[PDB]
């Protein structure tokens, strides 16, 4: 529905969705490649 | 709080005999000790159909489980 679409696009939902995506990216990358202190 | 401060100063001045301590001027909670004694005697006559006290915090034996104390009198 239109109202659900508008509610999903409010500021808190967007910022938390972006934060979850970024956190997932970082956690997965550190799962596969940990202990990266510098570019070798 | 002035009791605590007075004790602190007396201890700092090397005068432990002027403190509010059990080895010095004593402030004994006589009413609390009396009610503890009353509740310890409750299983006897005041609550005759009770086998033991409501809690051993008031007094009695030291209930210990395994190697640790479960509950003992709290003076």
């Amino acid at each position: 529905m239109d109202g659900l679409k508008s509610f999903l696009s409010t500021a808190p939902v967007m910022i938390m969705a972006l934060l979850t995506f970024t956190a997932g990216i970082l956690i997965e990358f550190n799962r596969f490649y940990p202990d990266l202190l510098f570019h070798p | 709080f002035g009791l605590y401060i007075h004790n602190d100063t007396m201890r700092a001045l090397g005068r432990p005999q002027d403190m509010f301590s059990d080895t010095a001027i004593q402030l004994q909670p006589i009413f609390a000790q009396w009610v503890q004694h009353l509740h310890t005697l409750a299983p006897g006559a005041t609550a005759p159909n009770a086998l033991a006290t409501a809690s051993y915090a008031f007094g009695g034996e030291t209930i210990a489980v395994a190697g640790k104390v479960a509950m003992m009198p709290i003076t």
């Binding site: 696009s9 409010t10 500021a11 967007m14 550190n30 202990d35 202190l37 510098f38 | -």
Partner: protein, 142 residues
């Protein structure tokens, strides 16, 4: 012959002694060994821990430079997309409502265009619409 107080971790007795007991960070049991072999390249102090040198030399460019460009690109991306989205919103007859309720189509459209932020930034600076004149900005009384 620089860093006479620093030694490579490969021949540092303290680092070598303490590197056989590295903890496994992840579920992979080889993470400790991988960290131990990867940290042997850097320079260790007497405490056995690696150190970073940021004097500007390119031999240690991995310590600061490569991450510096890596961070700066992303930060410029974020700032540029945010600024461009704000500027585009400013002409919609209700910018505040579109500031709390994000225009997701326009938002993602601006997201996908941020990889060219240095070229866009220099073009804006040359075109003169990147920076406003001091006479057009509100200022508090002196």
């Amino acid at each position: 012959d620089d860093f006479a107080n620093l030694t490579p971790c490969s021949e540092n007795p303290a680092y070598l002694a303490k590197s056989k007991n590295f903890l496994n960070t992840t579920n992979d049991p080889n993470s400790g060994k991988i960290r131990a072999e990867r940290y042997a390249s850097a320079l260790c102090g007497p405490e056995g821990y690696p150190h970073l040198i940021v004097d500007g030399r390119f031999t240690h460019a991995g310590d600061f430079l490569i991450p510096s460009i890596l961070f700066l690109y992303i930060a410029g991306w974020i700032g540029w997309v945010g600024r461009s989205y704000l500027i585009e919103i400013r002409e919609s007859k209700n910018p505040e409502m579109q500031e709390v309720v994000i225009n997701v189509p326009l938002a993602i459209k601006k997201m996908l265009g941020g990889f060219l932020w240095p070229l866009a930034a220099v073009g804006e600076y040359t075109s003169g619409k990147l920076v406003m004149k001091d006479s057009e900005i509100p200022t508090s009384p002196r």
